[PDB]
Amino acid sequence: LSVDTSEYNRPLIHFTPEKGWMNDPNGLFYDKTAKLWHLYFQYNPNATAWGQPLYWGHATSNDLVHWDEHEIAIGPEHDNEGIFSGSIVVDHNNTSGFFNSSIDPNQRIVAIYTNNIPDNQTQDIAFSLDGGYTFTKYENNPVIDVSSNQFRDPKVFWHEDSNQWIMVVSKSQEYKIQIFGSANLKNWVLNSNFSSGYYGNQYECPGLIEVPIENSDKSKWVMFLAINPGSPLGGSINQYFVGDFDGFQFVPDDSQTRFVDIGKDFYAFQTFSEVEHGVLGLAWASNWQYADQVPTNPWRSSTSLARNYTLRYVHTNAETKQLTLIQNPVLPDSINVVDKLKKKNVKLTNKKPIKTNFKGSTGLFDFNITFKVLNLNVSPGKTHFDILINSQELNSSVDSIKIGFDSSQSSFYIDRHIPNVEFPRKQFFTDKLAAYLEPLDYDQDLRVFSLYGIVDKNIIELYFNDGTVAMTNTFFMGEGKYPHDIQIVTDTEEPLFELESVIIRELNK
Amino acid sequence: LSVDTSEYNRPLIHFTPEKGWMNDPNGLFYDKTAKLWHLYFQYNPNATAWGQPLYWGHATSNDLVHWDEHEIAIGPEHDNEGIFSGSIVVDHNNTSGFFNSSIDPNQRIVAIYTNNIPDNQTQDIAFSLDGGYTFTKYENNPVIDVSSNQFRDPKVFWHEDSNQWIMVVSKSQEYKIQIFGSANLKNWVLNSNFSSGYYGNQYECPGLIEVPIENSDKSKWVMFLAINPGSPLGGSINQYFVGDFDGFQFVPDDSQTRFVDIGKDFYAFQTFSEVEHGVLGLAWASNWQYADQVPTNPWRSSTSLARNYTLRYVHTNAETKQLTLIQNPVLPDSINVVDKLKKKNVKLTNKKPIKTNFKGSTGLFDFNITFKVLNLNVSPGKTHFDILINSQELNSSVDSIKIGFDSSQSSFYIDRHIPNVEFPRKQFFTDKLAAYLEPLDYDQDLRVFSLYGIVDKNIIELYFNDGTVAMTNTFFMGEGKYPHDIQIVTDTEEPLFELESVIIRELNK
Ligand SMILES: *[C@@H]1O[C@H](CO)[C@@H](O)[C@H](O)[C@H]1NC(C)=O
Ligand SMILES: *[C@@H]1O[C@H](CO)[C@@H](O)[C@H](O)[C@H]1NC(C)=O
Ligand SMILES: *[C@@H]1O[C@H](CO)[C@@H](O)[C@H](O)[C@H]1NC(C)=O
Ligand SMILES: *[C@@H]1O[C@H](CO)[C@@H](O)[C@H](O)[C@H]1NC(C)=O
């Protein structure tokens, strides 16, 4: 209660609850009449850790960066219980029978969630008559009960082609995504089971949505799947599958495993309902291994930025293209640019570092770099350049995290190691992570790559080659310290990298 | 040539070439008549890095721990070329036509390998008339040519049921394991293509073999597959698939992705031909990200220990079992025990550490622990115990690596970070790794786990719950330093962990 780390630790444009604990994002939807984005979330107001009475918290935004936190939206019947993860749909034609002519068609809000009770997990529904701020639970809940304690996280959507509601839900420890159908939101029929990819310990938060292919009129169905624990990166992770859907079964185009984000801290991804023009979604920006131990107070956890999802044919090797999930952050004009550094066609050497020199710092920065790898033979320890994110010097010390690229490995890397900062379960807080990527393009024989990164006080999101792979990681600088300046450096005496374009900005909410 | 790190850096019971560079193990087989295990390997005698003139190196052992290095077995025609990876079969019935009645059936040795030429990779064969020491290349090589630059690593075996030789080989950048059949070893027909799992950048070193199910006469076919780069852990990794095979098509039982070893340094796994009683194999114990940069001289790289492979139904979560690949190290009685510490039913507390007190060190140790997790509530940062592998004190400092278990996370971990040891591409040298595992057993309500680890001067191999998961990692202590003592410690004042059995031994060649 006495300790508030916000000044150096609290993101400016990632949603955080004012106080208490947050995990999975829930009930993501857009109110077309109010022009409002809704974020609900797994919420424990009573501690900075997971705990039951568990609630759906609630925040709204007009732009996906400025959030207004509201009163709790849904709560359990007993302190014994919790409103677990779930989604929202807008029942325009009152298929559910909950809504009058008094309720606007695009405000006919129905939440579908897991009700957690000792020894039981069921799918329940609730409706809102005030635009999603208060909910009335359905009298005949549960709408689905299969006598299981491992049965959770419904994502529901209206499937036009088969004229019905579809729910994807996990039968967690059976490693099945279960696809149900309903005309009602009330009466559900199990149509199929899907099992694939990286199993780990459990299936969680499934998703199923039609995603547009860039530069075309075509699309694919994409099944999303969260697993925790047992990620090959340790703890929790999201993966995806690309294929087709008929309203009854999902059929992947192949049997390959791919992760949505290859950072440590991107979990329980959900898409927004009622989005016209493409697919938008976000995740909980932490990892179950250490999420409840990180040195923030009086809150723990942020969401990721909202991201825009497309499919693109990209080279995964020099010979072969794969239809691949692309994501890029949603950053509206409402974000202010405090200051910026711009550079053009710079041949980087050890005597030519790029160094930001802004007046102060709000701890929110982005950098956008397009670079070419030149034909220069350099000693093996020097085939790289590095973006350094430095804090202010406090008590004679500067904390930094490093993002780099090695030309011999054709791989980006992060090193989020910060000495001296300790918290429980940091044995699982992996510091070094890498991402292999083929060139974005070729300028004659020269390999071209791009990188966009955004740093927001305790979270860095990296997007490689125009969103070809994304990597999300939190980081924890020592007390009082936060990002103040950015440097771009190399040890090569001659130029191995040309930065064709460098734009570094200090931003504000 | 002047610098030799062997005294502190060179493993004692993992094979290493006396000088030069080693990668993929090749041509693994047992000679039933000579009673000899054969190891061949990708070998460059001329540098401590990969390079053309590339050869098959050769070593033998009677016991899979004591290795005798021989003359080079196979070399390229030109400096421009290399004998790339491959396998060996014994042609008992002389289907190839290479072998007289003067060559013992168990000694009818044929190597099948990729010939690498500028702009071309083909599959070629060679025969040995002296028990596998010298080879003659087949007159009409190549035996398979698909006009490709990315077509390598043949693993071949006799398939009784369809009465033919089978080759698995990869069309690396096409993400296909190709299955060919032959009556001849000379004339091949393409039977099927297999594509699945984690794709990464490239498919490499496939294998396909019947693996015995424990307590059963039955087996499953397991398809092995190496990928590099693009491992989810960064760089290089091996994965597997469990299913059925009819001589033509491999059909997995499911479509899940699983890794053979979830350390950083276990790649290009191959199994030994001509094994009676089960399946034995080993891998190259490094990662392509940094393999040619680690601080050893005048050699680089070792193999893993030989491991014994079976299939077992194990709990991947509390409710569900999966038929899973299990592996345990091959350690004969020819290994000398210099000293040991043996304890029984001991409780770990901060005042009861386990400390090895041996007279000297050969730098080779194993530890074998079975432990129970007690019902004790402790603060979040203390829900663990650690095995410390400590060097001798040199420049008034001790180097240490750490292996532990956290009860709250049900996960083992390693931290191989060593201060003040630098080498190129260490940005990719991941220090922290973890492995989630359900209990081995329950003693009443108490969770039981097991751990076996072996440390051999610069490589640690970990086997959790009797080989349920394996994790292999190299480590590099400061100059002159190597493992000298082992500690088992905890910060809990009351016992959280009961060590039912602890055996720590100092071992020697
Ligand atoms: C789906 O899985 C459940 C197991 O929880 C089973 O009851 C049901 O029969 C399966 N249905 C189909 C169509 O495969
Ligand atoms: C997302 O991208 C799509 C293209 O699929 C575009 O139509 C839409 O305007 C974008 N939306 C946002 C919020 O960036
Ligand atoms: C990065 O810069 C390019 C122009 O080179 C621009 O098209 C792109 O929108 C920028 N990305 C972001 C996320 O601001
Ligand atoms: C490479 O090593 C081999 C040893 O087998 C030797 O014959 C040859 O001289 C060396 N070649 C080069 C180009 O260094």
Ligand SMILES: *[C@@H]1O[C@H](CO)[C@@H](O)[C@H](O)[C@H]1NC(C)=O
């Ligand atoms: C296997 O793959 C190759 C591509 O290299 C293709 O030409 C061939 O038709 C495929 N064979 C089968 C049976 O799918």
Ligand SMILES: *[C@@H]1O[C@H](CO)[C@@H](O)[C@H](O)[C@H]1NC(C)=O
């Ligand atoms: C490997 O294990 C099996 C038991 O499944 C045994 O038959 C065989 O002798 C073992 N091989 C070695 C080399 O220990």
Ligand SMILES: *[C@@H]1O[C@H](CO)[C@@H](O)[C@H](O)[C@H]1NC(C)=O
């Ligand atoms: C470890 O110890 C157990 C029981 O003490 C024994 O059965 C097993 O063989 C040992 N494992 C290894 C790999 O030495």
Ligand SMILES: OC[C@H]1O[C@](O)(CO)[C@@H](O)[C@@H]1O
């Ligand atoms: O808080 C309980 C909720 O948390 C999650 O387990 C994943 O983090 C969900 O699957 C569940 O709804």
Ligand SMILES: OC[C@H]1O[C@](O)(CO)[C@@H](O)[C@@H]1O
């Ligand atoms: O040295 C070339 C050899 O190395 C490998 O690429 C994998 O490390 C093989 O696929 C190939 O045979």
